Design a protein around this ligand. Structure first.
Ligand SMILES: *[C@](O)(C(N)=O)[C@H](C[C@@H]1CCNC1=O)NC(=O)[C@@H]1[C@@H]2[C@H](CN1C(=O)[C@@H](NC(=O)NC(C)(C)C)C(C)(C)C)C2(C)C
Ligand SMILES: *[C@](O)(C(N)=O)[C@H](C[C@@H]1CCNC1=O)NC(=O)[C@@H]1[C@@H]2[C@H](CN1C(=O)[C@@H](NC(=O)NC(C)(C)C)C(C)(C)C)C2(C)C
Lengths: 300, 300
């Protein structure tokens, strides 16, 4: 037992991190087969199409540890640069590029100068920011999930917003949210709490012996959502309820009953108590995160 | 910016995890050079010396993925079993075995059937338990730190206490705390909060723009420790103050002034507010964790 904010093992991704230097900019790239993916802002209101037509392959210095990689072609796809290199990464895992939905969680392998610094778990917020931990040099660090043996890359880091939160793209270079890779006025947008994730985490708490927040009451989806809005929670849909089905089945607590418990927590606060060692309602565990950590699924 | 509970990249350790099966018990082992380390309770008020004299090398089935490892010798060192195998692990990193002090943090690579499931950050509690996330089959999972290129193994998982917390050994098989690998009555002991870590995390908060908890006041080490005891905090020593020196220097906040701020937080609570996204005072970041995450140190 126990419940921790758990990241995927990062080895498959560590084997793909490289350093990309162009002019005065150094950042990280993702080396998969014979392509290195990095943020297009590594090139020297900028017009990146113009900037890129003016660069040569030899302007890109790609370093994989102490082995320099020669670029033999380059292209831009949305806000990512794809550097064709003459060597396929022998450590390339099985992988997919996925564009995730807000509320979905992923692991971030924070990197500097192509070298992994740390791994941690994030959620894509409803306002399409992530609350990451990123210092200068971390651009090109990627977020990912692992499904059995396959790495699903879902995030590459590009920039920090003035509120200290972070914005980036999928691995095809499309930003999450309305952000652009320009030094222009941009604000994150009002965030909301991921309701289906809070409920999942309450089920995690029950599976682990926390029960103090339960009540004998129930609610309709409609009356719950009426309370959710006042507290800046995302609407809970029937699809969310369906997703919460297995956790409901394992614990014997109807989804709508756990909603009634969340309602009472929202209205009365936690009154000096903790749930899974938190004094806040935690929303960066999906239902599938809870099932993975509470049943013991492995990867390889 | 941002501050996250960050684990070390786990790739160097993933390359060392194996499955050890003996009789009806399957658990994880750590394969370094030609030795596999696992908990001595994998062997069939038990007297392990007797139990082990009665086992043969061929009773130990060691699986490294889809390659079976043949045991050519075995010995017991305290509560760990060392299985000599005929093949040195080619993925063996630079490594050390270290016995950590309470208050020190480490990353845990949770494993089942030799296969990594997830990575998360832990502290050794003052009562020598860890608040981990461990299901049946996770024994032999290890905790570790990485210093540049070297993996310092500090923990191997053995058992769960009735309060849902966890106990284990160093990699030489000595338990942390008074625990024994017997199914006998054992209780964790009253825990306390790691004071020097809370102060480090408050400095992390300042480095990241949280300042609301600061005050114009100061305190002596003696008067602070008087308040610390009432709230079940570990005594803060001058050595702790010295360790907090760099963070004090970077932020311009004397250690004793940050103590006065912690005093006021202990006495008034946080009153509806959060620090680094927590509504509790967080104590599983060491001073060195804060400096690593707020300056960008990498590993390789
Ligand atoms: C990245 O390029 C790298 N080399 O690591 C860097 C990562 C940043 C640095 C601090 N924390 C991070 O996550 N990204 C950038 O420097 C991007 C890059 C240029 C500006 N930029 C920023 O993140 C800036 N933010 C910013 O300008 N925000 C606005 C005003 C657009 C809302 C800044 C000030 C450097 C943090 C581009 C092309 C956006
Ligand atoms: C480990 O052997 C494995 N195969 O993974 C297992 C890990 C446990 C299982 C559930 N969560 C864990 O961390 N460890 C054990 O089974 C150890 C082993 C035998 C009992 N044991 C326990 O952890 C038990 N706890 C326990 O007996 N606690 C006392 C009463 C001593 C305080 C239990 C009940 C299985 C959780 C030994 C030799 C201690």
């Amino acid at each position: 037992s126990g419940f921790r904010k758990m990241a995927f093992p990062s080895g498959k991704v560590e084997g793909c991190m490289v350093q990309v230097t162009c002019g005065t900019t150094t950042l990280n790239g993702l080396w998969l087969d014979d392509v290195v993916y990095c943020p297009r802002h590594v090139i020297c209101n900028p017009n990146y199409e113009d900037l890129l037509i003016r660069k040569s392959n030899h302007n890109f210095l790609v370093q994989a540890g102490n082995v320099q990689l020669r670029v033999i072609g380059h292209s831009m796809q949305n806000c990512v640069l794809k550097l064709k290199v003459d060597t396929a990464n022998p450590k390339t895992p099985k992988y997919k590029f996925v564009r995730i939905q807000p509320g979905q969680t992923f692991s971030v392998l924070a990197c500097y100068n192509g070298s992994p610094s740390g791994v941690y778990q994030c959620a894509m917020r409803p306002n399409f920011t992530i609350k990451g931990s990123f210092l200068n040099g971390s651009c090109g660090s990627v977020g990912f999930n692992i499904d059995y043996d396959c790495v699903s890359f879902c995030y590459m880091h590009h920039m920090e917003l003035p509120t200290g939160v972070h914005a980036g793209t999928d691995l095809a270079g499309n930003f999450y949210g309305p952000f652009v890779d320009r030094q222009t006025a941009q604000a994150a947008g009002t965030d909301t709490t991921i309701t289906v994730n809070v409920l999942a985490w309450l089920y995690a708490a029950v599976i682990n012996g926390d029960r103090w927040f339960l009540n004998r009451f129930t609610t309709t989806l409609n009356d719950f959502n009426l309370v959710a809005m006042k507290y800046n929670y995302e609407p809970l849909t029937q699809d969310h309820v369906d997703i919460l089905g297995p956790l409901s089945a394992q614990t014997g607590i109807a989804v709508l009953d756990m909603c009634a418990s969340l309602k009472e927590l929202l209205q009365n606060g936690m009154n000096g108590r903790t749930i899974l060692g938190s004094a806040l309602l935690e929303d960066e565990f999906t239902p599938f995160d809870v099932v993975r950590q509470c049943s013991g699924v492995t990867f390889q």
